[PDB]
Design a protein around this ligand. Structure first.
Ligand SMILES: [Mg+2]
Ligand SMILES: [Mg+2]
Lengths: 171, 98, 104, 67, 55, 72, 55
RNA sequence: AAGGGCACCACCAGGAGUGGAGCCUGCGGCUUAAUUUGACCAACACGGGAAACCUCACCCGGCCCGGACACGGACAGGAUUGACAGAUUGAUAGCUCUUUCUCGAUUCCGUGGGUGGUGGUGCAUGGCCGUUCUUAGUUGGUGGAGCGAUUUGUCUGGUUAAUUCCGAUAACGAACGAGACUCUGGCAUGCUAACUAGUUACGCGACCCCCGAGCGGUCGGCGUCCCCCAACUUCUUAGAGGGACAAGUGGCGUUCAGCCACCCGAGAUUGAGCAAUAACAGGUCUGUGAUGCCCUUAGAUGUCCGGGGCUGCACGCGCGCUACACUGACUGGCUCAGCGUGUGCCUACCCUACGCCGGCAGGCGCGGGUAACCCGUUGAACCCCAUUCGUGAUGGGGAUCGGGGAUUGCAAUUAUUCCCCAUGAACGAGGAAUUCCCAGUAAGUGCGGGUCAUAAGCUUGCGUUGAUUAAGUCCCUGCCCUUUGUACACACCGCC
């Protein structure tokens, strides 16, 4: 059909939509322990599920924020009233999400915590939460013009091959 | 800046019909995708809601190329006295079927 | 009535498409509806060769990005009406379906 | 920089007084010395500006001139 | 005079700024907040319009 | 393929089809007495050539050649 | 500013009619498969879209 | 400074070359109003940078605020907003002037304060990327040596692409990187399937035949999912699996790690992606609503419009294309591919079969395709087969230049591109130097994609034809390790 779109452009369009939605939810829920988003699309309706550490904060006053967000993504993306849904799920083992730990490290540094103390604190928490290894690198300038890159690593780590794709979560 | 009264009330009444309002960051767009029948372009939508944000009535969020303005509690009451609405009318985002 | 339909399966990953094809074939055989095997369209490979560097410096390093689209056609033939006989979608995220009339 | 031309003086409006371009006579007889542009969207409220050789309605009521 | 005709330095390891050098030297040994640590650190509208325009 | 590749495909198609037809319908002992002739003449008459091609890399005109580089 | 010439110049085609959908950049724009995406931006969102380096 | 090791971005043995010629393009210089700018192995067809407008950041002019918000003024007796005509201007910018209307609290003036910027700083930064380096190197636990930092492990040697292993051995047991891994290619007449791939068989045919072939030959002719009205997956597509391991034999070797040869086998080394500890004041603020600080902010370095420029030439350099010819050129005929694209949120722009008109570039009417359904059985090129040319700067080469006709675009001049007919320049295998490369490789050769309204001498891939030389070494060029010296530790761009 001339109205319809080719499959190659359709998958690309869905990929662009998911990337934009994930980026927007990142810029909005960064202070709310945002981890990720997954979408299950059917021709009848689409279900958008946000994985976050604090769903009690993702939800507004009596669910105001979720209605607010599902309405605003509907207006942007042109969805029908019934084809847009919004659920939030608490992420199990929040210390094993590289994005969640990165957000908390940002919050600690914005508070003013020393780099060594904050990085060692998050490094410990990842380890007792259960992991084969972890590593945090903090780069930039602190109190001076010259910049530094501090590295904090423990446990086993891999870098090469296919296994790093499904073994090492990077943020 | 300069908008007609019908343009300002059309934007405000949509911001109260639903608490949110998106707008593609294109100041040269001839008409807003929403409220296009009211004949007010996206540029006047931009400046009206950036004036709301400066006064503190709305919060401004930016994605790739779109704004995601969010009406706040402080902005709710200002819209009430601006549009002469009773303390019973609420946006759909604030209250639905309740 | 005699109704026949063509269900078209499309996915980006092989395992999700294989799972939906498997349990839909099994469901059709359980309802004793004669069904044709899932025939595979050749994979649509979207290749984009950009340059890794965001500037003009480097050793002219080019990055190749692949996107695979896997497509399957499954044919359902029933002597009676068919839409009421099979009313389940049995889908998971990452794969889409579209059902058409066999004549259409 | 170093603009050879001088600063261009933008137009200043005349800040004219009340309209008062129509009066009454003989205990009140409405008499307008300004025309009316009779288009439907122009309306009977607006009055055509009278010039030295032409008439021009305030809205875009075309422009009727006598050649 | 540290540059050639184009504007590239003939000495990259000769720090051209007075406040900083090639290596990063810590401030006060790495103490205080907002700084790297040290060993001590390590240890509805439509219905309203409806009733408005009904009369 | 091209002209030459079609030629080589044709000749080994004739040999492989005949040797398989002989194997299927009559004795393979008399298949071997012509199969040994074919291999002792040219192994490609019965076994395809595995070498096909090499991918082009982003540093030069072809699979292995690199572009001219200048230091001055 | 004036409506006659503020947008008079036609841009129904050319490099200036297309900008990146992520950062409005008009350079290195990948329009393949309807991407319409600035090059360095597509590298940033490559995995999120679905493109994966197989080789 | 010495000793070992490795490498076609080192050589050997060679191949194609570049450097010589014309032209395309990128740098430097010159000129300019501007000829915007970054970059000097790891800059110089690089910023996906093939710029007429935009792009644009540069030059010459001209509109607008899109200067939020707070406060003080003026104000429905008017804060203010637009505008016909003339002049004025490139402009049908009410920009300004004469002229009066119209707009109605939305503004305007002032004081603070925003904001934006392809403006500067990559020597303030993040991220990303390049290089060292894709070389093989790197680090814990326990134990030994030490008062100690530290050291051993991580090594004389053999071997490997590889601290890859074996072996000696105060070390043993590990971790990262290497490998392993994922994708791709080669074989499965083994399985699963397929009217959006087909193949065989059969039925209508159409033609060649009749010397008779007759179960004769060709058919990309029509049909057997036109669903009762054939089967099957070899060929095609793609899933699950298998297959290959130095596995077998012989030899060399501590007879270990491994090396060489051979049979059987599709394959006895298919190419990629990923890729350590760390460093490079390496490149990017001109990719970003990534960003500190500095600058500008109304006569704007913001933004828009008109024009020009980015192309400009006494010259130098780099990446390339075309050639110098007969192993050829021209003409005609025969004739074989595979990646892969294809109608759009903004976005106005698709791939094209068929018929007619023109000599060509093209134009017109009908369709098909959102695609294994249509282009398409991708009738590609080189090559192959015939004719002419005949060693002549010749029918080689097609630069420079004249006239004409078309398409795209609002706009083609400084020629967008294409076509036709004209002129016919250097160039007769290129000095010193220098690049890439080991099997479907080099190279000849075309075809897709990206850039695109118009477009490729570029780049990225694909396919066709397809070799010479080599199975080594440290001679040159670099890098790694060990030893060594050190007054260096901001580490030789050091210190003094
Ligand atoms: Mg490996
Ligand atoms: Mg000529």
């Amino acid at each position: 059909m001339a109205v319809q779109i080719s499959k190659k452009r359709k998958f690309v369009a869905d990929g662009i939509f998911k990337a934009e939605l994930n980026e927007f939810l990142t810029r909005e829920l960064a202070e709310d322990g945002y981890s990720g988003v997954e979408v299950r699309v059917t021709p009848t309706r689409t279900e958008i599920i946000i994985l976050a550490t604090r769903t009690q904060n993702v939800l507004g006053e009596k669910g105001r924020r979720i209605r607010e967000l599902t309405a605003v993504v509907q207006k942007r993306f042109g969805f029908p009233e019934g084809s847009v849904e919004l659920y939030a799920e608490k992420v199990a083992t929040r210390g094993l999400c590289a994005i969640a730990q990165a957000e908390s490290l940002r919050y600690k540094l914005l508070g003013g915590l020393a780099v060594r103390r904050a990085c060692y604190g998050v490094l410990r928490f990842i380890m007792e939460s259960g992991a084969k290894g972890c590593e945090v690198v903090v780069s930039g300038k602190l109190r001076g013009q010259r910049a530094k890159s501090m590295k904090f690593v423990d446990g086993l780590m891999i870098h090469s091959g296919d296994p790093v794709n499904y073994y090492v979560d990077t943020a | 800046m300069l908008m007609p009264k019908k343009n300002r009330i059309a934007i405000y009444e949509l911001l109260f019909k639903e608490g949110v309002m998106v707008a593609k960051k294109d100041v040269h767009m001839p008409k807003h995708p929403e409220l296009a029948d009211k004949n007010v372009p996206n540029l006047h939508v931009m400046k009206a809601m950036q004036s709301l944000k400066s006064r503190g009535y709305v919060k401004e969020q930016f994605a790739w190329r779109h704004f995601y303005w969010y009406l706040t509690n402080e902005g709710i009451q200002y819209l009430r006295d601006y549009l002469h609405l009773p303390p019973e009318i609420v946006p759909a985002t604030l209250r639905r079927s309740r | 009535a005699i109704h026949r339909i063509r269900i078209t399966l499309t996915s980006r990953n092989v395992k999700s498409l294989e799972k939906v094809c498997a349990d839909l074939i099994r469901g059709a055989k359980e309802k004793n509806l004669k069904v044709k095997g899932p025939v595979r369209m050749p994979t649509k490979t979207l290749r984009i060769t950009t340059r890794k560097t965001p500037c003009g410096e480097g050793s002219k390093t080019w990055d190749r990005f692949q996107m695979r689209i896997h497509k399957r056609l499954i044919d359902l033939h029933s002597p009676s009406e068919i839409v009421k006989q099979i009313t389940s979608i049995s889908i998971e995220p990452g794969v889409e379906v579209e059902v058409t009339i066999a004549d259409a | 920089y170093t603009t050879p031309k001088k600063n261009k003086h933008k137009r200043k409006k005349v800040k004219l007084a009340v309209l008062k371009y129509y009066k009454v006579d003989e205990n009140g007889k409405i008499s307008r010395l300004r025309r009316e542009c009779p288009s439907d969207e122009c309306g009977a409220g607006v009055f055509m500006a009278s010039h030295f050789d032409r008439h021009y309605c305030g809205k875009c009521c075309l422009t009727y001139c006598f050649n | 005079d540290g540059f050639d005709s184009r504007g590239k330095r003939e000495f990259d390891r000769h720090s051209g700024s007075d406040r900083s050098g090639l290596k990063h030297e810590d401030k006060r040994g790495g103490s205080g907040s907002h700084n790297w640590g040290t060993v001590k650190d390590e240890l509805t509208l439509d219905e309203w319009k409806a009733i408005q325009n009904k009369d | 393929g091209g002209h030459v590749a079609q030629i080589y495909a044709i000749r080994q198609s004739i040999s492989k089809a005949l040797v398989a037809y002989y194997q299927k319908y009559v004795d393979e002992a008399s298949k071997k007495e012509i199969k040994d002739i074919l291999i002792q003449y040219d192994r490609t008459l019965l076994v395809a050539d595995p070498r096909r091609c090499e991918s082009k890399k982003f540093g030069g005109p072809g699979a292995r050649a690199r572009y001219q580089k200048s230091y001055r | 500013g004036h409506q006659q010439l503020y947008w008079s110049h036609p841009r129904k085609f050319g490099q200036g009619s297309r900008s990146c959908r992520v950062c409005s950049n008009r350079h290195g724009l990948i329009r393949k498969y309807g991407l319409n995406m600035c090059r360095q931006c597509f590298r940033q969102y490559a995995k999120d879209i679905g493109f994966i380096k197989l080789d």
